[PDB]
Design a protein around this ligand. Sequence first.
Ligand SMILES: COCC(=O)Nc1ccccc1
Ligand SMILES: COCC(=O)Nc1ccccc1
Lengths: 412, 412
Amino acid sequence: SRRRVVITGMGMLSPLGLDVPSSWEGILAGRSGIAPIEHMDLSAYSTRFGGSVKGFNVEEYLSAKEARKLDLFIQYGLAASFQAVRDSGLEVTDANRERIGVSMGSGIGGLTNIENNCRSLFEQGPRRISPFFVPGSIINMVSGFLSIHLGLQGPNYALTTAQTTGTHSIGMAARNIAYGEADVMVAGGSEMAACGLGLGGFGAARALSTRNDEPTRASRPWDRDRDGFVLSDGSGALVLEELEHARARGARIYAELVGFGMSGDAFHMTAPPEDGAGAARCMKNALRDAGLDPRQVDYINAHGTSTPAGDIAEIAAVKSVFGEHAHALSMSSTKSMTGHLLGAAGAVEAIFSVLALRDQVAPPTINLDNPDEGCDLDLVAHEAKPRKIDVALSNSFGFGGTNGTLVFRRFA
Amino acid sequence: SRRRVVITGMGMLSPLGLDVPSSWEGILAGRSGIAPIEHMDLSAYSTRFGGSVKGFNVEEYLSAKEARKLDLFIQYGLAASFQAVRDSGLEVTDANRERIGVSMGSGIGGLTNIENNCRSLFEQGPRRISPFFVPGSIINMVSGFLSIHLGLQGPNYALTTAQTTGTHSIGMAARNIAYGEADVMVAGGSEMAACGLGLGGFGAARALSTRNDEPTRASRPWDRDRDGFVLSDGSGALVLEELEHARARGARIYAELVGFGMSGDAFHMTAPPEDGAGAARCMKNALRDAGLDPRQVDYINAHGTSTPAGDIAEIAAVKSVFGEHAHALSMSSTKSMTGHLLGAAGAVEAIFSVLALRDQVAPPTINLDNPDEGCDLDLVAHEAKPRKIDVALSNSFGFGGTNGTLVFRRFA
Ligand SMILES: COCC(=O)Nc1ccccc1
Ligand SMILES: COCC(=O)Nc1ccccc1
């Protein structure tokens, strides 16, 4: 047997805003957070735009001294974690601190501060490198720093499963609570890969939209004119909590995390299989974990990256899993608005899945002007769609063919 | 309900050998794998030596054409995983590939790859960045490439918890099996942070021994003259397996994995607390998990990194957990010989811990000439000690106050 897991706190930085309510307001209004990148010369790059976090003030969270030590991806993670802990109302004590852990991940982590330290290293050699360089750059430091600032003494770790990180972090945090290893986890991921190596690195694989003339139109999942994903920055954090623990302290509960699914495609390094066999197993695995028949799913937050091979794989996967129900469920890609936050994607997208339940509204897929061949599902093109949502899936399909699925349900 | 987990295979690259038996011969013979570094110019660096993998032949495992595209940390992880899977004698099939997962972790991952592409970006421009840069450098592609080559469709992920990564990777892989998400997991870690950024970053923090004139005497855990850790390279992989599934196929079983603990110090970003309180909480968690009397523990493979603060803290954690029994058990740091494989440290040390069980011998702590104030336990100074070992415990501690404990016992 098993303990039930509920969402009691949520926090976020996105290209749409500096917290959940402002980001969600963007999602439902079909607003784009995509813009040419400022403060960085991208002249020599085939992509010149993305989702940046706009107007971020780290000193709302940290002294300027402790922020100088930390890559932007750590800052962003800590912001979402702090938002989420505050949102939860949870009081940490000597009595419960050993039962409260953190699992915040990143796809690449401290790329920006690595890039800035290479400069120092080749020009001037090793003596300029900062003392805080290693601890200020490694992925596990969001979990490290948050545990120290808050006195969290419970399972302390970080996933890095590329674009699946946020989904795997939340999912395996849930498992820690379900199986009695913790009563509370702060879980999700953060990403800031908007640096020469990120844009350059993805640019070299021609994985990125090159639609420099219309950055708001670049992210157009399931549309025949899409030409790869948009690179976006930010963070999601949820406070996961055991149900009796949450009820006892009178917490506001958003939704129940009822299921977690993992799988491997075991196919290709970057490209899913045409038929989404992997994503289909992962989804089947998640619904079984939740004890739910596929018919009961109402909303799917797709991966929906706006890559040609990835979007079509997800359609195949859903038709396969849901058969006669695949047209009844609504499925949108919020990346149409936010772009791809990589290891943070599944975190912000689990929050969007939780709010979709709170507000009975399916977020739009904007720019879905001309569906491709076989993209005839309910993809919620252009505008939000109010509707019944008892169960919501969030999907993440990553490099290595690492799949993750979270199943949320209305709580009462 | 919770299923039992055994070790059916192991693999390794270490500074002492290109497999497990060749590494173990060096461990038992009290042999150092620390030497001046050859592959680069370290004259501008405060540390010019480490534990390199010597004579690694990647064409023993992969085509040169694929090897070229992958960072040494991925090559090291795949070689270790390949040895482990071959040693398990497991046959991957359509009947079982869905139940066979992989969790192989790293601290920093493709830092060499990141440094070279950094060199390409600044000296030439973004257009010179490898198309293979991202899939070839990110931490989760040991799990991804392994799954692609062997057809492993099970849970597919990677931890990055700095110097704890290997212990964490293995423990959580055993949770996957314990709770029935998988029947087999390939778990452990790989590290190749021996480049300008790694040696420089850790130098910047003054974390590294500077004993360039006697590199084999540098790593001296608990010795009064220790001046920091020795940076080393390699990989550890184990096949983790549900017990009945092991019995069902007549698998050779090296030992059983009975216990796993985690905790946060919640103390400092890089310094362990002087009393070892977080380490203590972790080992108690692990022992309760294993259903053990602390006095059953015969051998501890210590973190034993050869830093002033970390070493003293381990004694304090062990004396606090084990009381008067702390004097009867043998504790040793094989890092005295291998150096600190960082993210791979827990994986190779989990293997040493298992081989301590098979051969009934505690590996020595070499260079322990003058034990420090309070380091008055059986630290197996100088020479291997053949002795009764029914239970072995492996510790790892990391930046972020992140702790991991693995408990192995003999299986009949
Ligand atoms: C070395 O590659 C650069 C990069 O941005 N990598 C990544 C970032 C997030 C998710 C997956 C991969
Ligand atoms: C920028 O960091 C360089 C590095 O090697 N970091 C690390 C490697 C292994 C474990 C923990 C940290």
